């Protein structure tokens, strides 16, 4: 369909095949925060004197699937109901129903200029018959010609996926329900930044997120019948 749809497959077969990998048993992996099934870790990266910190977190969230985690986590028309980080965003361009390509601009965190973004998103259904169907969203920088002329931001470069997976546990109700995700981030800052206020700022800010998040979905889908 569009001209996307390779680098889309890739992109999304690179998270299937590596980020879903378990990392408990993984030292490689530092366990930076947990709270229940929330466990949020990092990896120690520099370029050039960048962080890159590679993010990855687990959860598991009651009563919500897999298939409603990514329509909200995907779904613009929402975003404000949850994002809490950005000034701006806007939708650059329609490439398929699934997929969309987002300019946005994030909070400044003083004393670090402001950073924006130019991704692609995509929202992928993933079949599986043991094994669980999974539903992705990968969010990843492209270049685009109507990319905004902002000289108040540093762009930041990013590869995120949210990929869900749903267990139900034997007319099945929102309480026999669990999502399993695992949420992964690598993004480049660009520029400089302090690497304490880049560290600070996703330490605080990617727990804030996931805990935020995904009360949503469970707020937003109560009630409402089961979307698997
Ligand atoms: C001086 C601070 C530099 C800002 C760097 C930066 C840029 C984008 C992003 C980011 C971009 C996309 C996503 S998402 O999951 O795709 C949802 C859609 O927005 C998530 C996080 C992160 C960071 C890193 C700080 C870290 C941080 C973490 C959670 C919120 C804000 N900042």
């Known amino acids: 369909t569009h001209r ?7 992109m999304v077969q690179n998270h299937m095949t590596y980020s ?3 990392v408990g048993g993984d030292a490689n992996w530092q366990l930076v925060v947990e709270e229940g099934e929330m466990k949020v870790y990092r990896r120690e990266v520099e370029e050039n004197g960048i ?12 009563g919500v699937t897999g298939h409603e985690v990514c329509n909200y986590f995907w779904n613009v028309d929402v975003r404000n109901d949850w994002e809490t980080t950005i000034e701006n965003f ?6 398929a129903d699934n997929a969309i390509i987002i300019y946005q601009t994030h909070k400044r965190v003083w004393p670090a200029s402001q950073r924006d973004v130019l991704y692609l998103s ?4 993933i079949p599986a018959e043991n094994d669980p169907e999974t539903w ?6 492209v270049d685009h010609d109507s990319a905004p002329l902002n000289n108040r931001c540093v762009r930041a470069k990013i590869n995120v996926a949210m990929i869900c997976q749903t267990l139900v546990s034997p007319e099945i109700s929102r309480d026999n329900i669990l999502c399993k995700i695992t949420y992964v981030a690598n993004v480049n800052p660009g520029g ?3 690497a304490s206020v880049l560290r600070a700022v996703a330490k605080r ?6 805990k935020r998040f995904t009360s949503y979905v469970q707020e937003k889908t109560a009630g409402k019948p089961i979307l698997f």
Do not use: G, M
Request: hydrophobic fraction near 45%; charge should be neutral.
């Open 205 to 210: 800010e990617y727990p804030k997120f996931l």
């Open 90 to 95: 806007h939708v650059v361009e329609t490439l």
């Open 20 to 22: 879903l990998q378990d």
């Open 4 to 10: 996307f749809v390779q680098k889309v497959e890739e």
């Open 136 to 141: 992705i969203v990968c969010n990843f920088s």
């Open 192 to 194: 400089w930044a302090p």
């Open 51 to 62: 962080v890159l910190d590679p993010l990855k977190a687990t959860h598991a969230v009651k």
């Open 122 to 125: 995509v929202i992928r259904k």
